Amino acid sequence: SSSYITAIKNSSVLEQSFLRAILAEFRRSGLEEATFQQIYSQHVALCRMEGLPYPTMSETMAVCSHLGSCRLLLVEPSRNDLLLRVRLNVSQDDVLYALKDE
Amino acid sequence: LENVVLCRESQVSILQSLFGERHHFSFPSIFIYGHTASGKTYVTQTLLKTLELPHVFVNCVECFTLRLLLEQILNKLNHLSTEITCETFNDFVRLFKQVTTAENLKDQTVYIVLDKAEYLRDMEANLLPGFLRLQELADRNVTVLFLSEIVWEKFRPNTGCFEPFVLYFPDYSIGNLQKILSHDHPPEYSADFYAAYINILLGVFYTVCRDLKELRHLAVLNFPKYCEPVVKGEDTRKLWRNIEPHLKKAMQTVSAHTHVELPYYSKFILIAAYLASYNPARTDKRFFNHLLGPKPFPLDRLLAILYSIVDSRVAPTANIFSQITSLVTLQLLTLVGHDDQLDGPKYKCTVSLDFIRAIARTVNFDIIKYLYD
Amino acid sequence: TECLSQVQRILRERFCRQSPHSNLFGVQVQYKHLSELLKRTALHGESNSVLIIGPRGSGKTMLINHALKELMEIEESENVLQVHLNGLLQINDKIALKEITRQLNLENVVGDKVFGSFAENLSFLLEALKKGCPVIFILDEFDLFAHHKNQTLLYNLFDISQSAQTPIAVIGLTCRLDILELLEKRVKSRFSHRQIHLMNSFGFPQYVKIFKEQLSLPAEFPDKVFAEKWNENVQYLSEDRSVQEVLQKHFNISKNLRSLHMLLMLALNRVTASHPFMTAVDLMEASQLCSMDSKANIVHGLSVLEICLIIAMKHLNDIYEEEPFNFQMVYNEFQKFVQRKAHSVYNFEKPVVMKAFEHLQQLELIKPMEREYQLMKLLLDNTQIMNALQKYPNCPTDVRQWATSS
Amino acid sequence: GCFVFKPNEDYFNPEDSKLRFETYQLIWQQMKSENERLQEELNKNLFDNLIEFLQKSHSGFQREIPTAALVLGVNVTDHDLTFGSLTEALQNNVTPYVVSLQAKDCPDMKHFLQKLISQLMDCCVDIKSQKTDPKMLSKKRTTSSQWQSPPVVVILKDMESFATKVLQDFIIISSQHLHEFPLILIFGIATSPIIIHRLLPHAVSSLLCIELFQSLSCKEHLTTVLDKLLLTTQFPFKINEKVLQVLTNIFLYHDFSVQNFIKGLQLSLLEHFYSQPLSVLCCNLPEAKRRINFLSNNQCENIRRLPSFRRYVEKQASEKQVALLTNERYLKEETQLLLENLHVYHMNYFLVLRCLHKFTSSLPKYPLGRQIRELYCTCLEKNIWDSEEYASVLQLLRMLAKDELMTILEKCFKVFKSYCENHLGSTAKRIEEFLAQFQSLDEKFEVLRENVVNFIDCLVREYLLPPETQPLHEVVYFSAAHALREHLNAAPRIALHTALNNPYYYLKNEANIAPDICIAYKLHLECSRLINLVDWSEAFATVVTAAEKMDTSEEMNEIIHARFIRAVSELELLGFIKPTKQKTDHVARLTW
Amino acid sequence: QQTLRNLLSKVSPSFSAELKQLNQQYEKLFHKWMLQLHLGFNIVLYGLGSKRDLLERFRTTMLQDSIHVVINGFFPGISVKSVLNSITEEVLDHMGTFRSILDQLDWIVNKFKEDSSLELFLLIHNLDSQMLRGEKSQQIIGQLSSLHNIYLIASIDHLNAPLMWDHAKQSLFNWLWYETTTYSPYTEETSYENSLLVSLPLSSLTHVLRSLTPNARGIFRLLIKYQLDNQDNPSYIGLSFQDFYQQCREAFLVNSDLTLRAQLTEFRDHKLIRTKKGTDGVEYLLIPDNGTLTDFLEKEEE
């Protein structure tokens, strides 16, 4: 079986909204690259919509290194810190099925 | 060594509590960030000197290679013999178990204090996550105490690591900066009067630098200058109104002359290099914003504008080309094609305009309408 | 008393050393999958080489050491010769060979000839062991292990695990997900595939139970009355909804079961001076000392010349947008603001303004990508500065009007 | 392909080689030795201040680290000599712990520390009679417990070519523990102390103690070495004004260095000793009198037949011309007193030239010459009283007659009152002749009339053009300007332009016959915007089709194409056209 | 190339007598060179035609007694490592140290100060080339030649040939400059460089492979893997220096920024990595085909 959808299925809430921010920016741009402040703005919008508290980017970068450690996405270093160009390691319909199934 | 705290008591207390007594385990790794003013080795050294938790202190500025960093850790540790050699990391984890088996330090939580870890950040990729897991790597009751200038968020290895417990040592507050910037040790005055001086000086001066070291330096400079007309003339308000006239200029003043004699063709070379750097949107044809900086331009354009500036007896000798190479070693010109080839790349100008004005005016040339207008 | 030092000693080890506490939760099926495989590779000469993948901070090392201890309890010491490696220490092949020499007590025979083919080297290690026999290879931090120059200690282990048939388990402990795709194709096609574990977390209402079973004083008795009093206090704090509120807040940032250890560790550091039974508010401030905004602590501490400079950089985004700027445009914007203002307090002259830059570069809020008037890059958010300027305690009115102008 | 062969002195080449070469070696070795002594004298006022400053900043040690940033000149050529002298001075009057770093032997920190401790180990192990950092401190603790713990100083030679990282790390390491190991670094800033703020960020720049020093601005260094080296009576070999003009121009315009000037004077001396067979008696006067009296007779015919002496033949009477033409015994006698007159002309020339220099440097705006160098120039290019510049001095000197002129007549008279008996015998006894004029200086008309007779006697008597006034002057003077200038400062970018545009060497080629490559370049730059390959090959084929028919077409196309491609590889090779990649083909006109 | 060079020198260079005479002007100039070189000068001579045969005739007529290291500069095998290596073995009659270039530089300096009248002087054809120059490279020749006991003679061919000497670099060898012209075509350069009418084969990459550190070999393993794995993507415009820095740093091949930049610029010398500037201004890196790039590290790992 494939590891990645089960990793998304047992991810936390802010990770799932981070992947939703990733797909929202990838629907906006169309590209496979995105910088961290763009998906951070998308993540701020989604945490606003869900009634969650404010996503500080210490937490958002901790969760970005969480998802980059587990290779659901492909990362730039934490030294660049706002200028991280992220690619998505899995295809988009896979993560749409992963957050669509429930 | 004298005052342990000077009113930063809660962070001191939670760190002191976090150490615990000796026979039980503590944290693996503790990271402390904060500003460079903020006492981050004052507080921990006066904390560690009190209880005498048997510790090793290092600076990673000192150890520029990995072997010296392991060597001084193991050599300072075993005193608490010969140089107990370790070329590699696994040698350090091997010899650490033999070193930490003595009755001074068998049960005691050994602290390996690491200062200015941002230089350790580019030592290797191995050593930082290897150092963060030392409590279960060697399993010998260790707590590696980090302190750094930089945030932890850039400091992580982008694989993840054992995330340390992270403290923020706070910056000093204003009334705390009245108190702890030497309300102790005034030699000859009342402490009220030296506090009155520095209370006047600080509230003026709390907008440029909150660094305690240089403010201690500036205070011990401009306090005897303040202190002389009290003990000579004789009322704090009048000499407050005298000391701030000196304080504005002492602020402004903390670079002899910009003019440098040059050989004559070198003067004309960098005159031509400035003039082809600062308005060069193909305005070669006319005579013969500014704020973004110097635009790059190739060598033959520089030689053509050199021929236009100088009296026409110039020959392209070996010495004028050797001189144009030797201008770059003195960093008055820069090649921005770093390796494009030996043939003449874009040479961009890197000297200020007033210096250029002085070099142009010392050989009969007014150029400011000629330069960008 | 006896109680406070004893509860801190017995709770601190399973707290922050991650000592072997016997309760394990969410992992029973993966453990029971591992155990019979380990029993039949250990009891018999056959060699199968399982692989485990999970996230950092959860699972792996606790599971393999717990299964290790429970297997070591069964005798016939069975002459299983375990060997612990890590990916971090043994970076190269020459270190790895001598480390296997170290663990397997080989230096009675001297072996002092560096052989060319390292299959002969590994087979000699196993050969001189075999005439002297099971081994269990615990290959921790496999993702760093997969960056050898020639992948020797990856591939020769798999070749010997299929070919020498000395009892072997190559148990790889990884952290990144693609251990197969990062693995080179001769080894990944060779013998990487024994059955692969996956490791993940579980639901929040059982995670409150794992908080309670983590925090409770154990079946070891320091003093049984204090055990009953304190774990009843653990349950009374556990049923209170503010602890549940901060624990749900901790769940959505962290499913990790390592962050819970630290979050609870700060709370237990607070408790033994007075009120040995603690509050939900004490857990709340223990969560609060685990910070959320690392950058407001940096920006909040800075003096106001750096403040008006960094809001000038923010203003450099809000005209002539998206270039990596240099010093001169920052100087121009600062001068245009200070000429908009009437007072001559803050018209600080040119070499002072460079000092704020070369202090500010050390904080890495500004990035280098010529030497002093070039191409500097900002890595920051507006809104943390907008919150920081109202939290500045001695914030002057003119930089406040600069903030409202923006 | 660097193949080595293993093999498995007094050759110079009339002008016979042995005493010629020994005369060369004597003159140049003497000149170089006195050059080094006169180098080390001038910097004493500079670095004996530095000994005071370093002694004061060491002795108050019971947070700071002292730096003394020298501002040396732009001449990197002679920076070794000042540092050798300063190393000598600081080694003698302060500590025998002086090391220097070069900024080319340490790109990073391990090299820095290893070469520093190796230099320190040899410097301590000589005068008492290892990658580690704190062992250097342990070396300081062992090796000098006593003698008031003398401070180890390092000498960074180039501040500028150091990278900032290794320098910052070293200053923070040294400033961390200077409790033991007091270190006082002295980096030689090549430009100006502005750039120590540029190369050092503010935390490390705030760590220390800056006290800058000047250095000798090089114009009043070369006035000393030109003034002592050739303007004296002492050294037997003078120089022509035109060759000197070439040497001083390539000083003052391009190079701004003095070691290059001494290389130019050495080359002039060498080429003079190659050139002419009468150069052998370039000596002092009894050493001249040694073998004037015995010499080969064809060189004595050469002493008859060189053109300055034949000018002297033209001005003289027949009854001694008939015996002095050919016979050696009288030719020795007249040439000996001619060489004595040469020394006489030098000795009465130079001291009154210095007198005129002091009398002219006193003037407002100094219209004749700025310094002592150019006064040699203005009295030899034009005739001096013919020229308008000494006319401007003479027009100036009338109404300048006040007590400034009398006071500086007294002052210039005092400085050549030191040179009164430093001349010690004058060739007209002009010291006490002019001093007999100059002794009424203590007792406003008299300054005017005394001025008139002094400059008239002075300048009309001796201050004349040395070639025409003096026969046998070729022996002392060397003159070949644009022979030398191309040896010392050549121009290949003019040489290729010349030999490519006009490759006429001596049959008909000046404005099609005997290039291949100049045909290629000339035809390249007859279509002078840019070029593509095939049409350029056809144009070259057209012009050597003309060359062929001014003395089958497919074999001719083959050989024309082959010699075309042999030409075009060189025209790429020699700094012209750069290959235009990824297109079909073209060439790019890279030099206009 | 070969069938192109069969037609070379078929019939008739259009002058021979003045070429023989113009070269025959310069044979009188040689004892001046020997004396001038004995005093410690250094002769550069430039020209428009081939003058290495004049230097060969010079070394035949006057260098039958002394050591000469005839360093060709035209074929791409020679770098200054080979200069120091051959001058260590084949001149000093024993091998030297091996750790670094500066160590053998200082050591070969150190051998000559004690051994008087050893009297070795090399001479270099084509001192300016694509391979010979460099601030690491030329300064070793300079520091070598600055001594009393070593007398180099060179030839420069380029139009920008005195661009690679600062005054401090120029003060190491006392230059004086001769003018020559021969008009002979430079047959060795034009032979052994290239011809355009017909990339790099395996031999020079094996020679760089055998003269570099194994960590540099592991570095170009990474770079050639990232090149070969994205060969048919026309948007792949090369890795950045920062991306290659971190992907080199993850496999522990190099420690610092400056070490990797120095390795990059000494591999940029060999023309097996080219820098391209994109619209950011940041230099990306791509080397000059794909099928010749799999043969090496196919065979470097069997």
Ligand SMILES: Nc1ncnc2c1ncn2[C@@H]1O[C@H](COP(=O)(O)OP(=O)(O)OP(=O)(O)O)[C@@H](O)[C@H]1O
């Ligand atoms: N609370 C305090 N009371 C008295 N002096 C203090 C206090 N805090 C800091 N200092 C001064 O600061 C110096 C120590 O500097 P500090 O501890 O700030 O270094 P640091 O924070 O480690 O520096 P960096 O962060 O740059 O490594 C001491 O010498 C002392 O003079």
Ligand SMILES: Nc1ncnc2c1ncn2[C@@H]1O[C@H](COP(=O)(O)OP(=O)(O)OP(=O)(O)O)[C@@H](O)[C@H]1O
């Ligand atoms: N199911 C579980 N049962 C008991 N403890 C657990 C469980 N999951 C996680 N933990 C705790 O989480 C931490 C896991 O540490 P461990 O080293 O075993 O895994 P890991 O940290 O992911 O591995 P690595 O050290 O390679 O990152 C330990 O504190 C362990 O006590």
